[PDB]
């Protein structure tokens, strides 16, 4: 318990001098016991799906619950959780004169939640009747909406 | 901010009002309909309750002399005096149980010395109980003081 | 008569005492302001001051902070009652004070103002009371979870049944002003999407800029806007964003104004979306009966809707499952200890039915007066078993 | 045997039935120590 | 400034997937308001040492901190021991040299608030008002006069 | 005890599965401890009878 | 870096649960050493460069 804290209260000081790619990625300090015990497989019989549809459902329902319960050290997902995957064609980029840098900028602009204020703010004028929260940009949901990014 | 063509200076006060006010206008208190603030201290999950509240007056006491004109402390919602009443109306009930027992021992046995052996018996056991609860882990709770009366 | 004065005797945990201190909360309807809730907090302060001078020393009102959560609708006044000596009767005691206070706030008011006791204990252990929670296990949204909760509350109130009391914790559902910014319209005139997001964000919501110094102590600097330019929906167009071609562009050019329906308090239980249901047991039923008759209502709900009991309550209670096990082993060892010093198969039984002698009398005084089988009474029984065994062991020791 | 097994507590009612015996149970063994020692002595030393 | 569903999946959900690998845990609840304030409550078993239990929860939040908005990072992120209920609630008013319900709230937060929360193990202090801050009120009409933005 | 509470969460997940999704159990440590109790307490009884 | 190795861009929402968004490339344009020249970076003078 205390040995885990000292190791991750020192990694924290060296975190600012790492790449910005590694910071946003999964950094983890977990208790280890080189060997598994329960290895629950998950398959399909009737309504058939792939070895990818099954791996998403495991990581989006039963993985977060298992690692948190009764003190689990670290869970290893045998597959991967779903993610909005894009496959940039290099020939089509040259057709309209573009780069992977311009594609990354389009997703860090349209696919982004913004914190707008609210009608009748924190210090209002004396006598305002209504008070609601303003919504602005919303994070995209489906595969269709990512296809219509300008 | 700016320097428009003809040498005119656009300052931050010229475009906007500047007052030194609060960072959050979402909440404002009123002690008996009088402009007021406060400090709602909450417990630290396992703290000693009244010992924590005793040291709240430790820091507060050294702050009092360096106040400006008018600033005065007031005490609403307080847990402190309830524990002082639970000690003064249980140790008072302790003395009322000894005096009432003194009359019963005198009616049945007219000897003054006979109404004295039980009078020194129970106070000795009451003190011994404090030594056991201190050596194990417990404190003078509302429950364990009610155990002294029972 | 010992059995009959036990089952009918109700079950509590700990008596709600007069603590010289209580409080009351406030709740205004969908989309209220700071000025509207202040009117309600004033009328509450007047009932404790002018209409209750003898029983109230002071008050500490607050505008926009209830014990539910936060917002401009909520509120809380902290009452500090006068000392115990100056309050003589039962009329000037917390029970009677909060009784006629709640009546006054339901009569001459048009909001949701209440007043609760100071329980001590914690928030849990209300006795004849539960705390349910409705989980979305499948991939449904907020709009689908709302309909499932309305079918759970309605089914409980439509076929009771040694009845019930069920209401939500705080999902009153208020409108939200959405602003659809068309992306292709923006780039045509030559305005950056970055500049537009911190024009709307900093102006209306505010923005943390930098740390400055004031009289020695380092504080914060915030940038927002004068109050009058951000009250109504029509003040959106007053803000002009700068383009690359050195000319101004109004917000009405690219934006689009339209209302919506969201929720001001999204609760989540264990990595999934959820909605707390604060209901209590009936006046007749008690806890174990009410919870299992809420479980078969949860199973009748649509697909992708499970449940879990959140969240003080419980694991194993006191007058319930626990007490049987505590008294059970208490008899097993009492019999064994009346044998190491006695030696027979008769002496132990004589002491083992002086138990119901002291218990019939204990249940008589509690059931007759307005008390109940709580913690203080439950352990009063075991003291009686120690005094019924004590006296009976004098009858058995000297006689043998 | 009446008090101590009742003080095998379970849940948020941890120090309720627990402290409801062990507190008074120490007082039992201190009163049996006050009845095996002390009380015998004071009665013989000084009575009638 | 952020609304209810903005903070629900930019701050709240990010922490919830990274709230694993903790010793002892019954359940986890959560809230997300339209005012822009999130609050999770990881309840442990009965009397699980609140010292070590606090460290494990805040040695996991740290890994999910880089994937949050830059606005929330600079804002107050806090992992404190809780006990839903107050005890000492010290009011502060003025009588002689009168000041507002804002001048009083600054003096409380700039003298006696930092001392109180640090003393005798306080869980978390709630300021009933706000500390002072260089507040600016941008006029939109005056910005357009000199051609400027926020 | 950790593996017992792995089936605690898993059990509440079962009912809300789509069509076809079913749980299976390879590599398991659980049944080895059940055999170490049932072939030692059985050996305990065989030592008393003999 | 983004084309061959991939790149973490931003968080999006899918069916309630917040997941990740990754940008890389179709498999056939990053198998062999000869597919390096197919990628054209943009210059300041508005023309492509292999
Ligand atoms: C405090 C117990 O508030 C209760 C308790 C039980 C009830 C049983 C039936 C019908 C009503 C109630 C109310 C009731 O009318 N309250 C209304 C409500 O709205 N809220 C309240 S309580 C609250 C603070 C959790 C919440 C809020 O303001 O966010
Ligand atoms: C055999 C005598 O066990 C005792 C006796 C007295 C005690 C006085 C105080 C606190 C514990 C005990 C215990 C004791 O060890 N029991 C427990 C233990 O473990 N815990 C409890 S109480 C608790 C909730 C603080 C904690 C927990 O569950 O994490």
Curated annotation (Swiss-Prot), chain A:
Upregulating conditions: Positively regulated by MarA, Rob and SoxS transcriptional regulators (at protein level).
Intracellular or extracellular location(s): Cell inner membrane
**Could you describe the subunit structure of this protein?**
Homotrimer, with large domains that extend into the periplasm, interacts with AcrA and TolC. AcrA may be required to stably link this protein and TolC. Interacts with AcrZ. Part of the AcrA-AcrB-AcrZ-TolC efflux pump.
Q: Organism source for this protein?
A: Escherichia coli (strain K12)
- Highest taxon of the source? Bacteria
This chain's protein is named: Multidrug efflux pump subunit AcrB
In which family does this protein belong, per the annotation?
Belongs to the resistance-nodulation-cell division (RND) (TC 2.A.6) family.
Summarize what gene deletion causes.
Loss of susceptibility to contact-dependent growth inhibition (CDI); inhibiting cells still contact the target.
Role of this protein: AcrA-AcrB-AcrZ-TolC is a drug efflux protein complex with broad substrate specificity that uses the proton motive force to export substrates.
* Span of the entire protein shown here: 101 to 250 of 1049
UniProtKB/Swiss-Prot annotation, chain F:
**Gene induction:** Positively regulated by MarA, Rob and SoxS transcriptional regulators (at protein level).
Its transmembrane ranges are: 37-50
Location in the cell: Cell inner membrane
**Where is coiled-coil annotated?**
none
Tell me, according to the record, the phenotype of the null mutant.
Loss of susceptibility to contact-dependent growth inhibition (CDI); inhibiting cells still contact the target.
Task: Fill in the subunit field for this protein.
Answer: Homotrimer, with large domains that extend into the periplasm, interacts with AcrA and TolC. AcrA may be required to stably link this protein and TolC. Interacts with AcrZ. Part of the AcrA-AcrB-AcrZ-TolC efflux pump.
What's the family?
Belongs to the resistance-nodulation-cell division (RND) (TC 2.A.6) family.
Function according to Swiss-Prot or TrEMBL: AcrA-AcrB-AcrZ-TolC is a drug efflux protein complex with broad substrate specificity that uses the proton motive force to export substrates.
Protein name according to UniProt = Multidrug efflux pump subunit AcrB
Which organism encodes this protein?
Escherichia coli (strain K12)
- Which gene underlies this protein? acrB
């Amino acid at each position: 318990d205390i040995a885990q804290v000292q190791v991750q209260a020192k990694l924290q000081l060296a975190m600012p001098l790492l790449p910005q790619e590694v910071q946003q990625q999964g950094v983890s300090v977990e208790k280890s016991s080189s060997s598994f015990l329960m290895v629950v497989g998950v398959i399909n019989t009737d309504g058939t799906m792939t070895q990818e549809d099954i791996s998403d459902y495991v990581a989006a329902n039963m993985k977060d619950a298992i690692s948190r319960t009764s003190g689990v050290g670290d869970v290893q997902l045998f597959g991967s959780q779903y993610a909005m995957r894009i496959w940039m064609n290099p020939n089509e980029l040259n057709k309209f004169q573009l780069t992977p840098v311009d594609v990354i900028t389009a997703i860090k602009a349209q696919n982004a939640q913004v914190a707008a204020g609210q009608l009748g703010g924190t210090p209002p004028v004396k006598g305002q009747q209504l008070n609601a929260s303003i919504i602005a940009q919303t994070r995209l949901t489906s595969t269709e909406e990512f296809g219509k990014i300008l | 901010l700016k320097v428009n063509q003809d040498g005119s200076r656009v300052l931050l006060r010229d475009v906007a009002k500047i007052e030194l006010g609060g960072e959050n206008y979402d909440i404002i208190a009123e002690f008996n309909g009088q402009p007021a603030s406060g400090l709602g201290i909450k417990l630290a999950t396992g703290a000693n309750a009244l010992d924590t509240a005793a040291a709240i007056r430790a820091e507060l006491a050294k702050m009092e002399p360096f106040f400006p004109s008018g600033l005065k402390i007031v005490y609403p919602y307080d847990t402190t005096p309830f524990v002082k009443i639970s000690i003064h109306e249980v140790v008072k009930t302790l003395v009322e149980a000894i005096i009432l027992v003194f009359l019963v021992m005198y009616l049945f046995l007219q000897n003054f010395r006979a109404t004295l052996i039980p009078t020194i018996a129970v106070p000795v056991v009451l003190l011994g109980t404090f030594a056991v609860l201190a050596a194990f882990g417990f404190s003078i709770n509302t429950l364990t003081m009610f155990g002294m009366v029972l | 008569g010992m059995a009959y004065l036990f089952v009918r005797l109700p079950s509590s945990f700990l008596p709600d005492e007069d603590q010289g201190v209580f409080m009351t909360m406030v709740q205004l309807p969908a989309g209220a302001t700071q000025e509207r809730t202040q009117k309600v907090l004033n009328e509450v302060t007047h009932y404790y001051l002018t209409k209750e001078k003898n029983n109230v020393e002071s008050v500490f009102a607050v505008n926009g902070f209830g014990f539910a959560g936060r917002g401009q609708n909520t509120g809380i006044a902290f009452v500090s009652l006068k000392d115990w000596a100056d309050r003589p009767g039962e009329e000037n005691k917390v029970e009677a004070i909060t009784m006629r206070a709640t009546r006054a706030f339901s009569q001459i008011k048009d909001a949701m103002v209440f007043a609760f006791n100071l329980p001590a204990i914690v928030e849990l252990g209300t006795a004849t009371g539960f705390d349910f929670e409705l989980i979305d296990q499948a991939g449904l949204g907020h709009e689908k979870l709302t309909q499932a909760r309305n079918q759970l509350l309605a089914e409980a109130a439509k076929h009771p049944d040694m009845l019930t009391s069920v209401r939500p914790n705080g999902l009153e559902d208020t409108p939200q002003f959405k602003i659809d910014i068309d992306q292709e319209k923006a780039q045509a005139l030559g305005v950056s999407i970055n500049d537009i997001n911190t024009t709307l964000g900093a102006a209306w919501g505010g923005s943390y800029v930098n740390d400055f110094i004031d009289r020695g102590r380092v504080k914060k600097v915030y940038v927002m806007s004068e109050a009058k330019y951000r009250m109504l929906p029509d003040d959106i167009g007053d803000w002009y964003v700068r383009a690359a071609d050195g000319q101004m562009v109004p917000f009405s050019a690219f934006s689009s104004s339209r209302w919506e329906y969201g929720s001001p308090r999204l609760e989540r239980y264990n990595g999934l979306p959820s909605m707390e249901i604060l209901g209590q047991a009936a006046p007749g039923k008690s806890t174990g009966e009410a919870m299992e008759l809420m479980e078969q209502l949860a199973s009748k709900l649509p697909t992708g809707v499970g449940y879990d009991w959140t969240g003080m309550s419980y694991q194993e209670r006191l007058s319930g499952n626990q007490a049987p096990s505590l008294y059970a082993i208490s008899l097993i060892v009492v019999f064994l200890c009346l044998a190491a010093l006695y030696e027979s198969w008769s002496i132990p039984f004589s002491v083992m039915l002086v138990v119901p002698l002291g218990v019939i009398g204990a249940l008589l005084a509690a059931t007759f007066r307005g008390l109940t089988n709580d913690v203080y009474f439950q352990v009063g029984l075991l003291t009686t078993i120690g005094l019924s065994a004590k006296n009976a062991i004098l009858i058995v020791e000297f006689a043998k | 045997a009446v008090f101590v097994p009742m003080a095998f507590f379970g849940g948020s009612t941890g120090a309720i039935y627990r402290q409801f015996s062990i507190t008074i149970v120490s007082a039992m063994a201190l009163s049996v120590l006050v009845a095996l020692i002390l009380t015998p002595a004071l009665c013989a030393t000084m009575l009638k | 400034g952020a609304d209810a569903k903005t903070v629900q999946d930019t701050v709240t959900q990010v922490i919830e997937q990274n709230m694993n690998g903790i010793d002892n845990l019954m359940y986890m609840s959560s809230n997300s308001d339209s005012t822009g304030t999130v609050q999770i409550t990881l309840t442990f078993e009965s009397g699980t040492d609140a010292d070590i239990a606090q460290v494990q929860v805040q040695a996991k939040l740290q890994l999910a901190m880089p994937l949050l908005p830059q606005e929330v990072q600079q804002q107050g992120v806090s992992v404190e021991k809780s006990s839903s209920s107050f005890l000492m609630v010290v009011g502060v008013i003025n009588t002689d040299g009168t000041m507002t319900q804002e001048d009083i709230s600054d003096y409380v937060a700039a003298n006696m608030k930092d001392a109180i929360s640090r003393t005798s193990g306080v869980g978390d202090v709630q300021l009933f008002g706000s500390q002072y801050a260089m507040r600016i009120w941008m006029n939109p009409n005056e910005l357009n006069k000199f051609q400027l933005t926020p």
